[PDB]
């Protein structure tokens, strides 16, 4: 609240300093931001404690950055951490005390939890609460009565209005409890699903699962994990532990296919007990319990097919023990978020790898599903070898003179097709691919602009893939890339970042970018994170290039596009010039060649 002569807020008169400050490696700002030391001998103990109560926002190598909020604190109580259980240790760990504002905030957040509990039974949602006083003063707003369908006091609530009420209670200072007591539940018989000994659970995976299962009752929340970290395995394990009906929801045809393979590979459950509620193909969804479906079909808004209609009615009627939603970052979408209310589930676990977006709808994920249970440390995984180390880089490609003139001259937005297609980046990518091609490194180019992607591919006569590409040709190209030594590069369009199972690649060039989308960058980055059989963290075998054009709008997006990655700890190095580019022969080595491309670019319209 107090501002120094500079921008920083003043806290000299706010909180004191512990005499043994050096022993205590923890800081506590009044705003809730916390700065831990990654060099302290007791760093690990602090890391576990802070992660339990706070959600990371920046975890560079030396000094991590944690901020706590109401959602973060509620999760701590769910795992059994009381206000004194956390504040006492926080004061002990704090090297500068705890400001009263945080103290009262912690007290208010912890006490305002568990008073209101939401339980669904017999397809009816009852807002149970041991304390009756909470309900008495909770019915002041008229929305509650109209929302409601027309000790331990409970009342049934309308199915459709659950989401509206859930967000209302969050700002009402009375969060709802979504814990599932699968251990004590006889209404829905347990499913015959078991985890085979073959599956191996990594220490972070166990910790993420442990945080989800704070007590005998499973907690509904979001577990963010890298795609190469094996987030699919964790989802399977959670379903196996619940031992009740689970409805995994994908986002595309590829997503549903992989999940079924993951279930069979890691779960002993029989093949016949798994169904694919997919329009393209089905396996008698009503017949068995464990099902894999997609947001589009379940949330499909237009006319429903007769066969789908029966399945949809069957899904609505039944009650699901678990509702795994992979790629939760798309949930707050209008159609996608409707699926939450359409189906009934006790705890709706959420998995993903890039929990970031521009529109401030990510915060809704806290109430749409639950608090962010776990968010693995990408840097720590790199040290442990679970994830391939990446030498993130940003190759600056100076714009050719003529190209800039039209780019600056025109105030229209043809520039997206212009600065994405310039000779220097073309030579840069052409040179960059050539260097990696002779190094036996697998390349995965990317480009939002299909027009640029096709032009780059034909000139480099490489197997470019994109949306309307035939499925058969899509598989044929991938198989050659994985197997054929003669080919070690595939030019994938945006479809690559959506969902796929691609072979591990040593490098990932990105000539163009869709825009300032932290999702796409992290989505595309996860492709090379696939750990190799016998690599090492320090070898930096995996690389990532995000080619950009200097003095162009592309730079603004690139800096705005790397915010999420740097927060994890990745350092994006800049490369003004590439050694050996001049000696190596490359296309567009003469003014005429650039002129024809510019004319074609201008003729694009």
């Amino acid at each position: 609240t107090k501002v120094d002569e500079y921008g920083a807020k003043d806290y000299r008169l706010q909180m004191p300093l512990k005499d043994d400050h050096t022993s205590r490696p923890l800081w506590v700002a009044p705003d809730g931001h916390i700065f831990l030391e990654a060099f302290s001998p007791v760093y690990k103990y602090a890391q576990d404690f802070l992660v339990a109560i706070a959600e990371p926002v920046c975890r560079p190598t030396h000094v991590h950055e944690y901020k706590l909020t109401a959602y973060s604190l509620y999760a701590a109580v769910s795992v059994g951490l009381q206000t004194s259980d956390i504040t006492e240790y926080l004061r002990k760990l704090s090297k500068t005390g705890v400001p009263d504002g945080i103290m009262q905030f912690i007290k208010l957040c912890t006490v305002s939890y568990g008073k209101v509990k939401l339980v669904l039974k017999h397809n009816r949602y009852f807002v149970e609460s041991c304390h009756p006083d909470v309900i008495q003063h909770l019915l002041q707003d008229p929305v509650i009565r109209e929302c409601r369908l027309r000790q331990t006091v409970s009342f049934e609530v309308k199915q459709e209005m659950i989401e509206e009420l859930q967000k209302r209670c969050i700002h009402l200072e009375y969060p709802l409890l979504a814990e599932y007591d699968f251990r004590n539940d006889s209404v829905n018989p347990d499913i015959n699903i078991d985890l085979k000994p073959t599956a191996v659970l990594r220490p972070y995976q166990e910790k993420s699962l442990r945080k989800m299962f704070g007590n005998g009752r499973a907690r509904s929340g979001v577990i963010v994990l890298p795609c190469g970290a094996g987030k699919s395995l964790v989802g399977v394990t959670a379903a196996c532990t619940v031992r009740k009906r689970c409805l995994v929801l994908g986002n595309s045809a590829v997503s549903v296919e992989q999940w079924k393979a993951q279930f069979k590979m890691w779960s002993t459950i029989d093949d016949s007990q798994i169904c694919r509620f997919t329009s393209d193909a089905k396996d008698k969804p009503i017949g068995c319990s464990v099902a894999i479906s997609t947001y589009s079909m379940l949330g499909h808004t237009t006319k429903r097919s007769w066969e789908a209609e029966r399945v949809m009615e069957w899904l609505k009627t039944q009650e699901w023990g678990l509702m795994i939603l992979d790629e939760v970052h798309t949930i707050p979408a209008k159609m996608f978020r409707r699926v939450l209310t359409i189906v009934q589930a006790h705890c709706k676990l959420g998995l993903t790898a890039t929990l970031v977006r521009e529109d401030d709808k990510i915060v809704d994920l806290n109430f749409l599903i639950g608090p962010k249970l776990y968010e693995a440390n990408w840097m720590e995984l790199q040290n442990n070898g679970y994830i391939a180390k990446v030498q993130c880089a940003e190759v600056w490609c100076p714009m050719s003179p003529e190209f800039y003139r039209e780019y600056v001259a025109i105030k229209t937005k043809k520039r997206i097709l212009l600065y994405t297609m310039n000779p220097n980046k073309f030579r840069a990518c052409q040179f960059l691919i050539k260097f990696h091609e002779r190094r036996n490194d697998k390349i995965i180019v990317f480009a939002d602009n299909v027009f640029a992607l096709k032009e780059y591919a034909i000139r480099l006569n490489k197997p470019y893939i994109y949306g309307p590409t035939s499925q058969g040709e899509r598989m044929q190209i991938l198989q050659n890339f994985k197997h054929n030594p003669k080919i070690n590069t595939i030019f994938i369009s945006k479809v690559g970042d959506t969902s796929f199972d691609l072979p591990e690649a040593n490098v990932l060039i990105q000539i163009s970018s869709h825009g300032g989308s932290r999702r796409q960058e992290a989505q595309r980055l996860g492709r090379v994170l696939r750990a190799k059989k016998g690599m090492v963290a320090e070898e930096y075998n995996a690389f990532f290039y995000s080619l950009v054009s200097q003095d162009t709008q592309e730079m603004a997006y690139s800096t705005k596009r790397q915010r999420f990655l740097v927060d994890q700890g990745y350092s994006f190095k800049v490369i003004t010039k590439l050694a050996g580019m001049e000696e190596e022969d490359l296309a567009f080595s003469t003014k005429e060649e650039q002129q024809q491309l510019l004319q074609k670019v201008l003729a694009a319209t």
């Binding site: 030498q391 880089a393 070898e539 490369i575 003004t576 010039k577 590439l578 050694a579």
Partner: peptide, 15 residues
């Protein structure tokens, strides 16, 4: 063998 490229090993900025 399998050594890192020059433009990644050291800064390529003119400084």
């Amino acid at each position: 063998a399998k050594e890192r490229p020059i433009w990644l090993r050291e800064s390529t900025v003119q400084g």
